[PDB]
Design a protein around this ligand. Structure first.
Ligand code: CYC
Ligand code: CYC
Ligand code: CYC
Ligand code: CYC
Ligand code: CYC
Ligand code: CYC
Ligand code: 45D
Lengths: 161, 641, 160, 169, 57, 160, 160, 161
């Protein structure tokens, strides 16, 4: 994967040119936002389980997916769904810390759509659950950090779309 | 002779399968209680047991008549029963006189043996014994025994045996089914042996008769497939954890890598890739890499990934190089990507311990693999495969004849031996009765009694230990300030330090012996004999130890040297068997060598060391001489100065 | 970078960044100003460093530029100093990133194989990197020079 | 060394805690006046029951330094200050420390060590604590004094204090 | 009746609890005995005549 | 601690520590006074934190200390507070270490199995750690409170 | 116990247990209810036995609780009573086992070394055991008293 | 393995007590020595191959071990000895960084003596080579960090004896 810093390094090294004013500006921009990224990651780690719980309460429970015939019916499948959601949250936190969506594109979005289609995981309800996670995280971490997390959660949702 | 031993532990291959063993092993190999399935099998088998024992009773009672009917149908021209130890087109009766007495004996014995093993199979509830010992008997006896004749005899025995069971279709059906299995298996041709080819040129190829595999307990095999039910996938993952980590750490400690499990159960990664990533994980690193030196870590890794221990010196050499270069990831990648791994487990199958009964076994790593497969393997830290393989190629080590555990530390006081079970380190070597251990003299090298047997007793001077002698006269041999009190008491305390290693606590000294020595009534030899035979010596140094450990420590204290080999050890040990501790002490102190080295007035002392003891003393940084084991460059001032 | 390494470590154990890991990241990212200043110094004065290092190298190991040597000739010298400039670029990347991963995966994994193919003495290349380190240190402040010295030493050691 | 009785809500722990409440001046003056009270109302000393050789050198040094240095050394002991002699003092067992203070008092009474300032009088809280200690039994008294002087000198890890008793110039 | 407030108020650190063999366990008993120290015995080695007072049994 | 973590990581790869890892150790070593100060604060207020947190917990979840609850009884409540004190001590270990590894190795590996065997509800233990966190944060500055709350919430998340 | 001492003797001569040793073990076995009654009586009244014995000791030997005495001071007296408690417990073990080996191996081997190092007058330790024996004998019947007094006498002799 | 911090923590944990003043002093001492430890480790890593090279030239070359019949004869055995010295230097550096010899027992010494005895590797020669490593490292790293490295190299030597 690449974070912001290594992404800049790769972009420069492809052309064999030293770090210039533009690359320096990007690196400074990432270096400035590090404190906010780290604090948002700390908060997200503090309330990961709570975030997932509230998200599923808002988006999934008392729906079709939870009743017999729904794909969140059995306890095994409910646990699998909660595990998918906290995986999404944790990898979104990774991407936000790195300031780059590459980690999502490989260690999360690699055949995931094919897997869900083959197993019958409803993509629409998964997207709605991730949107609930986005809303809860934004309300719990702030506005700027909220949209920073929302960028990567939307990246995951688009990867599933 | 062979120069090393990998150890030898009792091996118990399964001779045949029985219903309780089948069910209990089915539960036990999965690390769980017996469930409804196995318990129900046990209930049904136990219920049928009374009927089965009835069948066995009736057949053993009438075995004579059944065998007689068989022998009469099969043989012609005489009475086969003179000495007891549907029809194939080619069947013809066999003549007793022509066929011969030895072969007639084998015919009758084989018929009775067939009936006996049929009763065994009835009782066991499984025909596995019959299949095992009958598939391929034909080819074993074609050339001296008629196959048509044997078939007709077995058919006659089957009919006669079933004739006793008009009861109902419970006894008759069982007897008929087991005899039908016997018949079809005797008619079977010999199956090919299972070949275990050498994965490389440093490992030999082997083969195992299929009957041996059929008898042994079958290894349960887990394969991850996309279509398995969720419960089956759970069982497969648990098996993978049991293999790689040696137990179910998820059940025990909730330790798990969830994303790897999701990937493998989805089919994103194969079981091979799952094994690769699990064995690289920090869980595996902490449990089976961090606690061990690389040499032992690679042996454990071979267990976990290939289901076997190292096979040769070359293999341990190669893989220790690999782990030295790239550490744990390189080791895991080399093992998992090996042609051998893919040959056995492929992409889907969880690795399994192969060992005895699953395939042909090698002699060269027999004991080491026995140890490796034990659940106590993680607590052996000393490498066992590199050590044993290297010792095969080299002469006998410097070691007690009965093993490394019988060598105590060569320290001032204390009988410290390695404990066989604590941090297992045993290093068996085949010393025959005539080997002699090379000992290092504490003194001038040329005074070693091997090269200079008349040097025995030559005091070692500055190169060896201090020697205490009752050279001066004893007091009272009135007046105060008699100087002969300090020397005699120094010698008494020296004798205590020699026999026990250190001085005793107050109230422990044998005061009567001390006064009887100070009064000239006994000699120094007699006093040390009293010390050695004292109940205190028994409690401290004889009682708490393996008999031969006690003897070895005794020999070191009394003769000032370890034992040379099996001759001394055997004589003292035999005395221990016959007479006991006091007689062993007597034998040591009344021996000729004691008299030669120590008279009636010399306190014993350390005369010799093993190489290990000397190295312990003289290889430390503060005691290691500058000229030992390195090039000493002469320093000269530069010529330009 | 340190961030990617920490994220990889955390993902290997299926967990969020620990408080200690987050503190290390925060300390690293607050100190980004010094790293950027050192990288700017290396970038702006690349020509002086490479020229002085090459001159001192050729004086120290004339056999390399002697007839028969790999660097012999105008074009061979130009290529050799191009390599030295490339390694300066790698050093600046490493200084900015906080670790040596970019250097490792751009110009140091398999260096021995490539130079053996080309017949170049890896000893001489490491010596050239040493000269670059010396010139850059003399051109820079003591703390900054010491900071760059770690990456220069990593390059030298893995190139020897 | 020997286990100290610190907090038990009994007369001996209570008096020990009270002695710990007193200032450095109060504590040092209290032990001086207790020393003057030893043998009549407080328990006598028995220095043969302590390995006082361990203190010998230290005592010699105190008997060699000048009167101002002597008073400063005693003040340093009472102030929990970090000096070589304070660390030496702290390394001893309770019996040795108490016998060391006893020998200091003996020397002061004999003049070899700087005496108390002339016409000094004990304070209120210090006198109350001393009267309490006088009210206790001999065994209780020795326990109280042992625990009083055990924490003097310097020990690493622990720290604090703000008052101090520098000198009497 | 069992009241958890009483136990909460009565919390003591585990490492501070006395275990077997601790001489602190005999502090109460030692206090109760209150051993009597001997009186300060007045002895002067100067005024003793060794030859006369030493027993001549 | 970061030192052991990096040493283990390097050892598994048969390599010396990278310059980035050494600089991380350097930063961690420098920033130790604040950690020791937070730990000193927590250990100073130990009994107060435990008692206040236990009072809050038993107020919030009376079923734990009511009939049938796992903590019902004078000895059971004392044991529950003893566990609270254990976990406070581990949190101080984590703060001093700058890492959650001492906490995890002493009191989180297999904790679910232990408390399942004992019958204790694990989520109530997590609640107890939450109460201890609140009490501890009440006695510290905002930055120090957040630093300690990191380890408190690590324990809470692992226990629920 | 007696079984272990007899076993050690029989094994030291490479022989099975003799008729005499077997009958001795048998007698210790079947007549084993009185031993446990004596042990229960000693264990029940350990507080009073040790307290009364200590009072008697300090009356007989006030010097040890006078200036210069080892037991002078509350803490020293507490430790002295603790030592007496140790020896009473060991006496009970000896009574139960029908042998003096456990007493020997727990509290007599090297006891003179320990008490010489501590400065403790060992003869006063034997006297304290004498007081404990007297009190315990007062607390039991005649035959039980004799049986306990034998082992108390063993301990006293080993410190006299 | 344990480092100095973990060592003091575990010594406190086995007794179930909080970190008191003395433990905090130990931690402060380690934090105060960490800068020197890191600098020495960087220096050793930069010159590891040179350190082993010079130690071998100082102790083993042109002696019995390298001639036919000596344990270092043949290129394979020479290389094996070199990389054993590399092991010892790397692990001594680890222990110096950690301020604790626990790693040495765990991943160097446990079973090494028996392995060398089975292979016939001379132990006294190995100790002399390690002492040469100590001297070269001290000359490269300084007197005090050289003494610290010497502590752990001597620990390895004593474990071999
Ligand atoms: C009753 C003894 C306890 C209790 C129950 C309770 N459950 C919920 C909500 C849900 N329960 C389930 C469980 C299952 N769904 C299944 O399909 C199966 C497998 C056969 C099980 C066991 C689920 C999935 C939910 C989510 C709701 C949904 O249907 O989507 C609640 C409501 C909780 C809330 O706050 O919303 C309750 C009350 N609660 C207790 O206290 C009892 C111990
Ligand atoms: C929850 C919002 C929805 C839901 C989820 C659900 N998913 C599965 C199964 C799988 N999910 C994954 C995804 C991942 N595995 C990984 O390792 C990662 C990368 C970090 C991801 C994103 C996979 C691979 C599977 C298959 C294997 C596995 O089960 O782990 C299920 C179970 C499906 C089944 O048929 O058993 C469920 C229930 N389901 C819903 O209805 C929600 C909308
Ligand atoms: C005291 C500070 C610590 C302690 C000590 C302790 N040691 C033992 C037992 C033995 N000690 C030795 C030591 C040596 N033998 C030698 O040759 C040398 C050099 C001269 C030494 C230092 C030995 C060999 C033993 C066993 C044999 C014997 O004891 O005679 C014990 C007793 C252990 C037992 O029950 O066997 C003890 C108690 N214990 C502590 O707790 C202190 C930290
Ligand atoms: C001579 C060619 C080389 C040499 C020899 C040397 N040996 C020793 C010491 C001993 N030699 C032996 C050997 C044996 N003892 C036996 O019983 C047997 C089996 C028949 C053998 C081979 C022993 C045991 C010793 C130790 C002392 C003793 O004799 O008991 C030395 C002295 C070493 C010292 O440091 O004193 C030497 C010099 N050394 C060379 O350099 C030659 C190549
Ligand atoms: C000559 C063509 C080149 C050359 C040679 C050179 N070699 C050394 C030193 C050693 N060479 C060896 C070699 C071997 N030992 C073995 O066991 C095997 C297999 C049989 C080989 C090939 C060894 C071990 C040494 C070390 C010295 C010793 O033997 O004890 C030197 C000396 C280097 C120095 O600085 O001391 C030299 C000069 N050098 C060249 O430049 C030629 C290309
Ligand atoms: C060099 C100073 C000395 C020397 C070394 C030497 N060693 C070997 C062979 C091996 N050394 C090891 C060592 C280790 N195993 C571990 O797990 C670790 C802990 C990190 C260590 C250091 C091993 C396992 C081997 C065996 C490798 C193999 O299987 O071949 C040799 C070669 C021995 C041989 O027979 O090939 C040598 C030469 N020898 C000297 O003379 C120097 C004093
Ligand atoms: C029985 C027995 C024993 C017990 C022995 C015992 C009980 C020993 C107890 C001994 C005692 C009570 C010693 C106290 C000494 C106090 C001194 C020297 C203080 C001087 C103060 C000064 C100079 C202060 C001056 C001052 C300065 C300058 C100021 O700043 C202003 C005022 C102020 C006054 C404060 C032993 C322990 C030996 C062994 C065991 C055993 O059984």
């Amino acid at each position: 994967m690449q974070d912001a810093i290594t992404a800049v390094i790769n972009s420069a090294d492809v052309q064999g040119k030293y770090l210039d004013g533009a690359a320096m500006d990007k690196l400074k921009s990432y270096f400035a936002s590090g404190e906010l990224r780290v604090r948002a990651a700390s908060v997200i780690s503090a309330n990961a389980a709570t975030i997932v719980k509230e998200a599923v309460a808002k988006s999934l429970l008392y729906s079709d997916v939870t009743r017999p015939g729904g794909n969140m019916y059995t306890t095994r499948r409910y646990a699998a769904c909660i595990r998918d959601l906290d995986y999404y949250l944790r990898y979104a936190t990774y991407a936000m810390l790195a300031g780059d969506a590459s980690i999502l594109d490989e260690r999360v979005l690699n055949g995931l759509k094919e897997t869900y289609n083959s197993l019958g995981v409803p993509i629409s309800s998964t997207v709605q659950a991730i949107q609930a996670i986005k809303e809860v995280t934004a309300s719990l971490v702030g506005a700027d950090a909220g949209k920073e997390m929302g960028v990567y959660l939307d990246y995951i949702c688009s990867g599933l779309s | 002779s062979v120069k090393a031993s990998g150890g030898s532990s009792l091996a118990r291959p399964q001779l045949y399968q029985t219903v309780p063993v089948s069910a209990i092993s089915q539960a036990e190999q999965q690390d769980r209680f017996l469930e409804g399935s196995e318990l129900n099998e046990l209930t049904a088998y136990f219920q049928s047991g009374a009927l089965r024992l009835e069948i066995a009773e009736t057949l053993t009672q009438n075995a004579d008549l059944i065998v007689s009917r068989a022998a009469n149908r099969i043989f012609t021209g005489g009475s086969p029963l003179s000495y007891l130890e549907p029809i194939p087109p080619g069947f013809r009766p066999i003549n007793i006189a022509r066929y011969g007495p030895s072969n007639m004996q084998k015919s009758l014995r084989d018929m009775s043996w067939f009936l006996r093993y049929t009763t065994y199979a009835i009782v066991a509830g499984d025909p596995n014994i019959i299949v095992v010992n009958t598939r391929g008997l034909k080819e074993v006896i074609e050339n001296a025994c008629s196959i048509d004749a044997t078939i007709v005899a077995i058919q006659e025995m089957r009919a006669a045996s079933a004739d006793y069971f008009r009861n109902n279709a419970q006894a008759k059906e069982i007897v008929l089914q087991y005899f039908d299995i016997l018949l079809s298996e005797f008619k079977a041709p010999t199956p090919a042996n299972k070949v275990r080819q050498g994965p490389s040129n440093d490992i030999q190829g082997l083969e195992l008769p299929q009957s041996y595999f059929n008898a042994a307990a079958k290894r349960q095999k887990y394969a991850m497939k996309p279509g398995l039910s969720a419960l089956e996938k759970n069982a497969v993952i648990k098996a993978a954890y049991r293999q790689i980590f040696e137990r179910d750490i998820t059940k025990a400690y909730s330790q798990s890598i969830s994303y790897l499990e999701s990937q493998v159960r989805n089919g994103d990664i194969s079981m091979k890739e799952f094994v690769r990533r699990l064995a690289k994980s920090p869980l595996y690193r902490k449990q089976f890499f961090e606690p061990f030196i690389n040499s032992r870590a690679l042996e454990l890794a071979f267990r976990h990934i290939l289901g076997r221990g190292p096979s040769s010196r070359e293999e341990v050499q190669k893989y220790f190089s690999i782990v030295s270069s790239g550490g744990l990831p390189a080791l895991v990648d080399a093992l998992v990507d090996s042609q051998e791994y893919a040959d056995y487990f492929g992409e889907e199958t969880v690795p399994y311990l192969r060992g005895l009964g699953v395939e042909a076994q090698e002699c060269r790593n027999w004991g080491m693999q026995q140890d490796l497969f034990s659940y106590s393997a993680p607590f052996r830290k000393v490498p066992q495969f590199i050590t044993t393989f290297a010792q095969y190629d080299r002469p006998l080590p410097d070691q007690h004849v009965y093993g490394s555990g019988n060598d105590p530390l060569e320290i001032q006081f204390g009988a410290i031996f390695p404990k066989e079970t604590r941090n297992p380190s045993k290093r068996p070597a085949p010393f025959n009765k005539d080997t002699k251990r090379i000992l290092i003299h504490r003194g001038p090298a040329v005074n070693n009694q091997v090269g200079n047997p008349s040097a025995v007793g030559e005091f070692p001077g500055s190169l060896g230990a201090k020697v205490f002698r009752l050279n001066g006269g004893l007091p009272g041999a009135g007046t105060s300030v008699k100087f002969g009190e300090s020397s005699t008491q120094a010698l008494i305390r020296a004798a205590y330090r020699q026999v026990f290693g250190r001085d005793l606590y107050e109230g422990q000294r044998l005061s009567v012996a001390e006064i009887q020595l100070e009064n000239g009534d006994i000699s120094v030899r007699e006093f040390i004999k009293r010390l050695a035979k004292s109940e205190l010596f028994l409690k401290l140094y004889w009682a708490p130890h393996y008999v031969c450990k006690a003897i070895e420590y005794m020999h070191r204290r009394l003769l000032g040297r370890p034992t040379y080999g099996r001759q001394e050890m055997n004589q003292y040990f035999d005395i221990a068997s016959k007479q006991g501790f006091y007689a062993v002490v007597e034998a040591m102190i009344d021996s000729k060598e004691y008299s030669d080295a120590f008279g009636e007035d010399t306190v014993p002392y350390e005369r010799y060391l093993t190489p290990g003891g000397l190295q312990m003393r003289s290889a430390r940084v503060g005691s290691l001489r500058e000229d030992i084991g390195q090039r000493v460059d002469k320093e000269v001032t530069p010529r330009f100065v | 970078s340190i961030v990617t390494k920490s994220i990889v470590n955390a993902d290997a154990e299926a967990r969020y960044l620990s408080p200690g890991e987050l503190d290390r990241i925060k300390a690293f990212v607050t100190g980004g100003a010094a790293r950027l200043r050192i990288a700017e110094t290396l970038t702006g004065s690349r020509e002086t460093i490479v020229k002085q290092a090459g001159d001192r190298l050729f004086q120290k190991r004339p056999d390399i530029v002697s007839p028969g040597g790999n660097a012999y000739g105008e074009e061979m010298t130009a290529t050799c100093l191009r390599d030295m400039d490339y390694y300066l670029r790698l050093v600046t990347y490493g200084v900015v990133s906080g670790d040596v991963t970019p250097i490792e995966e751009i110009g140091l994994v398999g260096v021995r194989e490539m130079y053996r193919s080309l017949g170049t003495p890896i000893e001489a290349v490491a010596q050239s990197v040493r000269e670059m380190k010396e010139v850059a240190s003399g051109l820079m402040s003591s703390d900054d020079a010491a900071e760059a010295s770690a990456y220069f030493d990593f390059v030298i050691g893995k190139m020897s | 060394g020997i286990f100290p009785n610190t907090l038990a809500a009994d007369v001996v722990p209570a008096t020990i805690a009270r002695f710990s409440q007193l200032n450095a001046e109060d504590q040092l003056a209290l032990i001086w006046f207790a020393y003057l009270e030893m043998g009549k109302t407080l328990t006598i000393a028995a220095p043969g029951a302590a390995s006082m050789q361990l203190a010998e050198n230290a005592l010699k040094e105190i008997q060699a330094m000048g009167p101002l240095q002597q008073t400063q050394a005693m003040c340093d002991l009472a102030n929990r200050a970090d000096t070589p002699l304070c660390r030496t003092y702290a390394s001893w067992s309770p019996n040795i420390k108490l016998g060391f203070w006893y020998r200091l008092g003996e020397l002061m009474e004999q003049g070899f060590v700087a005496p108390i300032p002339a016409g000094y009088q004990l304070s209120a809280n210090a006198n109350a604590v001393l009267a309490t200690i006088q009210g206790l039994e001999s065994g209780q008294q020795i326990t109280v004094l042992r625990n009083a002087v055990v924490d003097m000198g310097f020990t690493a890890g622990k720290d604090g204090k703000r008052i101090a008793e520098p000198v009497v110039p | 009746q069992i009241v958890w407030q009483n136990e909460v108020r009565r919390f003591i650190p585990q490492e501070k609890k006395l275990t077997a063999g601790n001489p602190m366990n005999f502090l109460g008993m030692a206090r109760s005995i209150n051993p009597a120290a001997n009186t300060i015995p007045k002895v002067s080695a100067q005024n003793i005549n060794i030859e006369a007072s030493v027993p001549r049994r």
